[PDB]
Ligand binder design. Sequence first.
Ligand SMILES: Nc1nc2c(ncn2[C@@H]2O[C@H](COP(=O)(O)OP(=O)(O)OP(=O)(O)O)[C@@H](O)[C@H]2O)c(=O)[nH]1
Ligand SMILES: Nc1nc2c(ncn2[C@@H]2O[C@H](COP(=O)(O)OP(=O)(O)OP(=O)(O)O)[C@@H](O)[C@H]2O)c(=O)[nH]1
Ligand SMILES: Nc1nc2c(ncn2[C@@H]2O[C@H](COP(=O)(O)OP(=O)(O)O)[C@@H](O)[C@H]2O)c(=O)[nH]1
Ligand SMILES: Nc1nc2c(ncn2[C@@H]2O[C@H](COP(=O)(O)OP(=O)(O)O)[C@@H](O)[C@H]2O)c(=O)[nH]1
Ligand SMILES: [Mg+2]
Ligand SMILES: [Mg+2]
Lengths: 431, 431, 49, 54, 437, 437, 50
Amino acid sequence: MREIVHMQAGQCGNQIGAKFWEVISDEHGIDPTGTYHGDSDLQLERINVYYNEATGGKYVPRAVLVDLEPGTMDSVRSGPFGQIFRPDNFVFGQSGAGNNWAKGHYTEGAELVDSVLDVVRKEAESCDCLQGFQLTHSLGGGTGSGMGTLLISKIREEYPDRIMNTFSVVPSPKVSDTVVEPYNATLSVHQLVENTDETYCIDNEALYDICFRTLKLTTPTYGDLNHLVSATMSGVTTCLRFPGQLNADLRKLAVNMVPFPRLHFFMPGFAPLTSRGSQQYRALTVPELTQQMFDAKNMMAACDPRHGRYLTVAAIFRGRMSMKEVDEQMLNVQNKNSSYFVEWIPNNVKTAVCDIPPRGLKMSATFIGNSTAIQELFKRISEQFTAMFRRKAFLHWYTGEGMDEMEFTEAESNMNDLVSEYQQYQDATAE
Amino acid sequence: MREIVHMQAGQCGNQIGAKFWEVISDEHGIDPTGTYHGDSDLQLERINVYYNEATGGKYVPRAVLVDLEPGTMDSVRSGPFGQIFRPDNFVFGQSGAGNNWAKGHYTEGAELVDSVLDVVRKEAESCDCLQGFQLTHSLGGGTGSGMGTLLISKIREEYPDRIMNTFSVVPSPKVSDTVVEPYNATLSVHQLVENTDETYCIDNEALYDICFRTLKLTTPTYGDLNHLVSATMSGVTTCLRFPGQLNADLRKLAVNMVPFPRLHFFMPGFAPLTSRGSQQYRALTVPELTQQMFDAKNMMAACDPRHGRYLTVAAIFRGRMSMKEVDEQMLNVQNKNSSYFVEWIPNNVKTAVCDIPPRGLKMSATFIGNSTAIQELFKRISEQFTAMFRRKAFLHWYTGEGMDEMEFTEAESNMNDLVSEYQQYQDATAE
Amino acid sequence: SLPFLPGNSFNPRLGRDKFHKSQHFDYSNEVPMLVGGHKPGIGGDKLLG
Amino acid sequence: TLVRDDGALQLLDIYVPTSHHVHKRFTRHELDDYPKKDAATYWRCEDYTQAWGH
Amino acid sequence: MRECISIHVGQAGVQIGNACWELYCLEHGIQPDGQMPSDKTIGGGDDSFNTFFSETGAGKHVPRAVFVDLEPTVVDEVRTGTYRQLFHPEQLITGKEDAANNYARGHYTIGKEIVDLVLDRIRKLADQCTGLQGFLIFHSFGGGTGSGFASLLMERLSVDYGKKSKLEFAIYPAPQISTAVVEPYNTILTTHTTLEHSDCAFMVDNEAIYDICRRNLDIERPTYTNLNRLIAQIVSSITASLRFDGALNVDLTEFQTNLVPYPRIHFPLATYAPVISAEKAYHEQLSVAEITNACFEPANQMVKCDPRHGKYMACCMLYRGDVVPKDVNAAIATIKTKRTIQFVDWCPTGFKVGINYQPPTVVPGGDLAKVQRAVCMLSNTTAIAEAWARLDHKFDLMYAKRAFVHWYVGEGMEEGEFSEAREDLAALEKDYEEVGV
Amino acid sequence: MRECISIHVGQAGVQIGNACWELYCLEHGIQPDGQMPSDKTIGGGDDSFNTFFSETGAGKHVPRAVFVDLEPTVVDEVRTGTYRQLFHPEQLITGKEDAANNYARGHYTIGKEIVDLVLDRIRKLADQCTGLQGFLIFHSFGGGTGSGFASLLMERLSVDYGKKSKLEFAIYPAPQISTAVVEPYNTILTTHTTLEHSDCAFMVDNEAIYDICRRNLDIERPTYTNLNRLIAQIVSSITASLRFDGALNVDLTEFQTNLVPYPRIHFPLATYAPVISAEKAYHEQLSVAEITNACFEPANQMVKCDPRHGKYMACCMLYRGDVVPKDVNAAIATIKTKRTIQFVDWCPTGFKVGINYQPPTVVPGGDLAKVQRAVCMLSNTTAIAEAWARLDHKFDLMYAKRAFVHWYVGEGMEEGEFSEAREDLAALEKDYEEVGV
Amino acid sequence: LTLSELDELNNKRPTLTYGQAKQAPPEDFIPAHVAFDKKVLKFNGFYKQT
Ligand SMILES: Nc1nc2c(ncn2[C@@H]2O[C@H](COP(=O)(O)OP(=O)(O)OP(=O)(O)O)[C@@H](O)[C@H]2O)c(=O)[nH]1
Ligand SMILES: Nc1nc2c(ncn2[C@@H]2O[C@H](COP(=O)(O)OP(=O)(O)OP(=O)(O)O)[C@@H](O)[C@H]2O)c(=O)[nH]1
Ligand SMILES: Nc1nc2c(ncn2[C@@H]2O[C@H](COP(=O)(O)OP(=O)(O)O)[C@@H](O)[C@H]2O)c(=O)[nH]1
Ligand SMILES: Nc1nc2c(ncn2[C@@H]2O[C@H](COP(=O)(O)OP(=O)(O)O)[C@@H](O)[C@H]2O)c(=O)[nH]1
Ligand SMILES: [Mg+2]
Ligand SMILES: [Mg+2]
C-alpha cells in the first residue's frame, strides 16, 4: 500500500498544509470530526495513502507539523479541519527564530530536530512500504527554510532510497515580504540541490496573477493561494490514490523528469482556472485544458518558459478523456512550439491520466515543467544575494550565532554552478 | 480454588491498597456497599480469589490493614470503597512509628505482631488453597518497612511454601521525602532478600515521569500515581482470577522469571498509557502495546534498562488478541535488541494472554522485568547509607531501641552482595 | 458553489471584528504539551472537540 | 440502489472507473439481442460436423 | 467395537480436545447436548460413532475422553461452555493447584495427588470398553501438567495396560517462538520419559501452523482456535479409518508397524493438504496429484523442520474423500522419481496409504472449506534431528550456569535427572545419525 | 486440450487481459461467475473452452492466465471489476512499488522479488494442462514492469519451458506519439529478450491503432479500451484455429514454421482487417476479396510503417467464418498479381492459408460491426526496420549527452548494457536490410 | 440561467449522482458437493421373509 508521509515547516508551510488536508479530506470524504461520510468505495480503497486508522472508524493525517513558535499552529488548530490532526505531531519550540536561516539551522532550531525526527520515525514506522516524504515550506524565513532543510538532510540521511520531495514557496521578484530572503534562499537552495528529489517552486506573484487574471477573484486573501497550491499537490498525488488508464507515482514522475541529478526545480500549473463570469463562454474540453495548461501566463512561478527551453513537461490529467486526443495535444504543442523544447530529447512530455477528477469538475489537468528558465529565479536570488554580501549587510546576525563566510561562499558558488548548468543544457544542441 | 490474602502495611501501603481494592472491585463489578452489581458471570466465577462471601450476599475483601497509628486507617475507611473492609482486620497501635525501623521491628511493632499474626492466621485458615500473601508497603518508613519485614518473616516461618509477593515502594533517586530512607531501605532489603518470593520495586520519580511526560495530567497527584500501581497489581493476578488463552499465575511468573533464588526484584510496567487528548487518535494494537512496554520511560522504578541486561521479561496481556502477534512481537524485540538480553538464557520472555481486559479498555498489558539495571538503585541506596553511616548520623534513634551497628554493617554487606551478584549475572558470557 | 474547488471559497472573516487567538500549545515546565482542549477558537467561537 | 444500465445520469457519475464502465456484466437482453453468436455460414448451413465447436 | 479413548492433559490439551470433540460431534451428527436430532439424519450406520462415543440406553452419546488439568480454569470453561451436557462430570476432573511450568511439580508433588483418580477414571472407561486399540494423549511440551503429569500418566498406563498402544499428539516448541522460559528443561525431561513409554508421538509445532495460516488460509493474525481446528482435522484424518470404511483401512497398530522402524524413532511429522479457504477452494481442481505434491512442500509441514536436510524413513499417507486407489499410485510414482525427496537406502517401499470414502467435515464458523478430498501425511525423517540438536544447544546454554535448576531440585527431584535426559537425547542424536547414514 | 497460458505483464498487459478474457468468456459461453449454461456455447462446443479455461470438476471454468503488475492499482481494479469471481486469487499478482518506467527497477531491483512467485503460478497452470501449446505474453515497451520484469520473466520461461512456443504481443512506441520520455531507453534495453527468448514477436503501435479507429470505425475520439478490443480480436482470430473446426486449421508451430525463414527474423506484422463500423458496413459486400485487399492496404496496419518500402517474406492468412477456399485462392491470386505487393525472390510460394469455420463474436457495446468473415494476416516484411530505425535515432539523440542514465545506473545495470543493446539492435537492423536487398 | 433550464438539474443534479450507479450483484456459484453436503433422506422399510 504505497503511501506518503507529509510534513509542514514554518508558517507558510503550516497554512499551506492546513488547506491541503482540507482538499484531500474533501476528496476522500472526511468530515472535520474525522470519520468517513463518503459516497463510494473508491474513496476509501486507497485512503491509507494519507490517513491512518485511529478508533471508531476515524482517520488521522500522516502529517508532521513543525514550527519554532506556536504562533500559526494555534490558528491551524483553531481553524476548521484542525481537530483531525493527532496532537503529538505538533512539534514546537519555545523560541521563534522567524527569518534567520542560521537560527533555524545551527542554533535554537537545532535542538528540536531530535524530537521532530522521533515523531517522523514514529509516523514512518506505521508504514508497510512508505512511498515518499513530502515537505511544504518557504525559502523566506528561518523555520520554514533552515529547519526545513535540516529536516530534508536528516531524512535523506536516514532513508537514502525514498522520494523526498518539497513544494516550497520561493521568494518573489517584486516586493520582498522579508529583507533577508536573498540570504535565506541562497542558503536553502544549496541544501535543496544536494538532497531533495524534486522541488515544485511556487511564487506568490504568479499566484496573485492567477487569482486576478484567470480567476478574477477581487479579494483573494491567502486562502485562494493555498487552495491553488493544494490543488497542485492533489493533482500531483492523484494517480497514487485513484485508478487511471496511465498511472504515475512520484518515482515515475522523477524518472520521466530530472535527467541530470541536480536539475529538479519545476514550475507547476493547474487547469481549468475559468474566470468568475466566463463559464458560459469557456468550453471545457481537452484542447482547452491543454491550452490553459501550456499557457505561459498560467504557471505558478514567475519564470517565463518562453525565455528558455522545456527540458521535460509532465501533464497529469484527471477525468473521462480520450487518449488519442490527449496524446495528440501533447504532441501538437511540441510540434507547434518546437523552439521552447530541447531537440536532444524527443517527446519531452510525459503524460499521465487518472479516472477520478476533483468533485464538481468533469476534467482537470496539472502541469509540472522542468525548463531551463528557473535559472532566471536563481539569477535573481544570486544578484540580490551578492548585492548584500559585497557590503556585508545583515551578516552579523549569522556570524554572531556561529556562521562563517565560507558557508555563504560555498552556497553562492554551488548556486551559480547550477545557473551555469541550466544555461549549458539550454544552449546544448542535438549533435 | 486458588486465592491470595492481601496485607497493607504503613501509610503508603494503606493508601495504595485503598485504590487496589477499588480498581479490582470495579473489575469484579462490586458496589461500594459491598454487594454485586455486575453484568457478567465471569466476574462472579473467580471472585473467591480476593473476596469472602459474608452472610447476606456482601463480599468482604480478604485484606488486613496494619498501621502503628490509627489516622491512615481512619482515612482508608473514610475513603471511597473503604467501607467494604471488615473492621476486625483494622489493628492499630496507640503510639507512632516515627519513621524509625527499630520502632516497628524491635519495639512497639513487636507487640502488635501477635495481633496481626492472629488475624492473618484466621484469614489464611478460612481457605481451601491459599495461593499466597501480598504485602503492599514502602521502604523508608517505620511500620512500612520494619513491621512489614516482621510480617513477612513470621508468615514465611508459618507457611514456607506459599507465594509471597511484596510491592515495595523503594526510595527515590533524587529528592528525599524522608531523611532516614537509606537506613530503612538497607535494613529492609535484607529481610526482603531472605524471605520474599518476589518483590516489585516501585519509584515515585518514575511514576511522576510516566504521569507527566506520557500521561500529561498537569498536576498528577497521588490518586493517579496509585491507580498506576493498582493496574499492575490487577494485571499480575488477572490470569489467576480470569480465564485466558495462556494462563500464568504467581508461581508460573516466579518460576519463569527468577533464575536464582536471590534475583527476585522486578520493575513493573503498564502500557495503554495514553494522554486524555490522544485516546481517540491511537490505534490500540498488540504491536503498539509491545512498543509501549519495551520503552525506557515506561518503567515504574527508575533504572533505565539499557545500562544492564534483561534476564527475563514477563508480559501479561489482557484482551481478545492474537497469539501470533504476541509471540512475534516478543521475538522481534529480542532479535532487534539481543545485546540487552543475557546470552545464556534463550528467549528471555514469558508471555500470557488472558482474554478479559480491564473494564474500560479493549486490551491492556503488564510488563514485569527482572533486569540487571536495579544495580543502579541498590548502589545508590548503598552509597547514601554509607554516606550517612560513616559519620553515624541519626544512628542514636535506632540504637536506643536495642539495635547495634553490627546489623547496619550486616545489611550494607548483604546489599553489596546483591549488587555483586547482579553485576556477575549481567556481564557473564555464555562460554 | 457547493463543491470546494480553487477560487470557490469566499472570505469567512468579513464582518468579524474580534480575532483573538488562544494559546493551545505551551511548555508546562520542560515538556511540550497541548494545554488547550477547553480554549475556544479564533474570536472565542466554540470548537468541536 | 440502482444497477448500472448505461443511463444518461449515470454517465455523470465520476466515481466509477472507465474499466468498470466499459467491461460490464452483460445482461440477458444484452446477450440475447445482436451479440448472440448465431451466424449463418456455408459450413453450418450445409451440415458439416459439429466437432470442437462449429 | 474399535473404540480408543483419549486423555486431554494440560491447557493446550483441553482446548485442542474441545476443538476435536466439536469436530467429532459434527462428523457423527451429534448435537452438543449429546442427542441425535431425530428430525434429520447426518447419514451413517450404527457403529461409526462407536469409537469415540459410548451409547446409553436413553440415547445419549457420552464421549470417551478424560479432560484433566491441575489448574481449575480451562476445564471449568469447558464445564460452563456449550458442550456442558455432553461430557460426563467425572471426566472433567481437575486438581486444585497449578503445576507452574515445573516438571518436578507436575511429576512428583501435584501429579501424584490426582494420578490415582485419573487411573480410576481411565479404568472405568476401559471396563465398559471392549476393543481398546490404544490411548490417545493430547498435550504440549510446555511444562508441568502437559509435561510432568503426562509423563507420570505414561508410566502408570504402561504399568497397568502393558501391550496397549499409547499414541501422543504432542505440541513441540518452535525453534525461536516459545512462551515459557523453562521450556528446554520441560521438553528434555518429557522426551526422556516418553521415549521409553510411547509407541508413536505426532509432533505439531505452533510456528509452522502460524506460517500455514498466514500463507494458505490468508489469516496473517490467527489465534489458537484455528490452530486447534487444524490439529483436530489432523487427528480426525488419522482416526477416520476406525469409523468409515474405505478402499484401504489402516489400523492403529498398522501405523506403528509401518511407520516405526526401530523402537526409538517414533516421532513422525504432520502435514495436511489442502489447508484451503472457501474464497479460493472452488477455483482449484484439488486433485489427488495436487494434494499429494502439496504434502512434500517444506512450507506446508506442520512442524518447523526442513525435510530437504534429511532422509525419509517411511510415509503414512491417509487419503479421505473422492479418492480412487490409482491416482495415489500415480502420485507416488511421480514423487519417487524426484531426486530431491531422498529416502533411506534400506527402505525400498517407503509408503503406506489408507484410502477412506468419507470427506473431511467442514466446521461452521471456521476457516477451512468443504473439500472433495484431502490427505494427511505422516513422515519419519532424519531431518528431525536438528530440533533435538537445537534443544541440546538450549539445554546446554541454560544448564551450564544451572539457571532454574533450583526450582526443580527443591521439590523432590535429583539433579542427575537433567543429565540423564541430556545423555538420552544425545543417544537419540546418535541413533538418528546411525539410521540416516 | 490444446491449452495456451496467457501471461499479462504490466498495466498494458493487464488492460489487454481485461479486454481479452471478456472476449474469451463471451465467445466460449463462460459467465463472469464461471459457468456455462448451454446457450452461449458454440454449437457442438462442449469442450471447446479447454484451451483457455479449466474445469474444476464442478462447473467452474478458471482461466489459464497470470496477471502480473508491480503496481497494485489496475490488478485490484480487476479484482473489483465484473470478473471478480472468474479469476483464481493467486492468478492476479501484485508487488508494492512499481518499477516507475525504469528497466533497472523492473529487472534488477524490485522486480526481482515476485518473479519466482509468478513462475510458480505459471508452473501450476502448466502442469494442470496436458497439451500445452505455448505462452502468449502481453506487455508494452513503455517501460518498467512491461519491459524489465517482462524481460526477466520471459527470459526465465525461455530457459525453463524450452519446446513450448512463446508468442509475444508487444506494444511498441510510436514514431511521434509517446506517453513517456524514457521509452527509447526502455525499448532499446529489452530487444534481447524479444530477439533471443521469443519464438514470434507480433508488435502493435498505439498511433497506428488510433489511425485505424479514426478512419474505419468512425470514432473521432478512441481510447485504450478500443485499442485493447482490437488487439483481443487479433489474438482470438489467431487462436481460434486451436479452438474450433476448420479446413486448413493451424496449430501455432504451423504458422511459425510457415512464417519465420530464419531464427533471427521473427518480428511480423498482424492485421485483422474486416475492421469497420456498422454504418459503413451497411454499404459494402465485405467479401473475401475485400477483406483480403484490406490487409495489404498500407493504412490498416497496426505498426506505423508501410510495407511498400519493403518486401514481403511470408504471409499467413487466418480466415474465420463463411470463407470457402475457392474465394481465398482467387484473392491470393489477385494479391500476387498486384503491383505494389512485392515478395522476396527466394520465396516463390509465400502464403500459409488457414480457414476456420467460426465467424467472430461481438461484444455488446463494441465498436466493430458483426461481420461473418474475418482475416488475421501475419506478414513478415522488411519494413519493421523503419520502426527499428526511428527507435534507434530517438535513442541516439538521448544517449549522445546521456540524459536519464543515472536512474538506470544507480539500480544495477552497468553502463555497457546500453551500448550492447544498441549493438544488437544494429545487428538486427542490418539483418533485415540485407534480407530486403 | 432561464427558468426553463433551472427546472431540470434540480431534478437531475449531477453532484447528487456521485456513487449512485452501483454494480450488479454477483450471483454465487457453489459446487453440488457443498450445497448437498450432509443431506441424507431417511426411509423406513418392511422386508418380509419366509
Ligand atoms: N496449538 C495450541 N497450543 C497451545 C494452546 N495452549 C497452549 N499451547 C501451547 O502450550 C505452551 C505453553 O505451555 P502449556 O501447555 O500451556 O502448559 P499447561 O498445559 O498450561 O500446564 P502448566 O504450565 O502447568 O499450567 C505454549 O508454548 C503453546 O504452544 C492452544 O490452545 N493451542
Ligand atoms: N494499447 C494499449 N496500450 C497501453 C494500455 N495501457 C498502457 N499502454 C501502453 O503502456 C505504455 C506505458 O507503459 P506501461 O505499460 O503503463 O508501464 P508498466 O508495464 O505498467 O510498468 P510501470 O512503468 O511500472 O507502470 C504506454 O505508452 C501505452 O502505449 C492500454 O490499455 N492499451
Ligand atoms: N502562498 C502562501 N504564502 C505564504 C503564506 N504564509 C506565508 N507565505 C509566504 O512566506 C514568506 C515568509 O516566510 P515565513 O513563512 O514567515 O517563514 P517562517 O518564519 O520560517 O515561517 C512570505 O514571502 C509569504 O509570501 C500562505 O498562507 N500562503
Ligand atoms: N505510591 C505512594 N507512595 C506514597 C504515598 N504516600 C506516601 N508514599 C511514600 O511512602 C514513603 C513514606 O512511608 P510511610 O508510609 O510514611 O512509612 P511509615 O511511616 O512507616 O508508615 C514516602 O517516601 C512516600 O514517597 C502514596 O499515597 N502513594
Ligand atoms: Mg495451565
Ligand atoms: Mg503501471
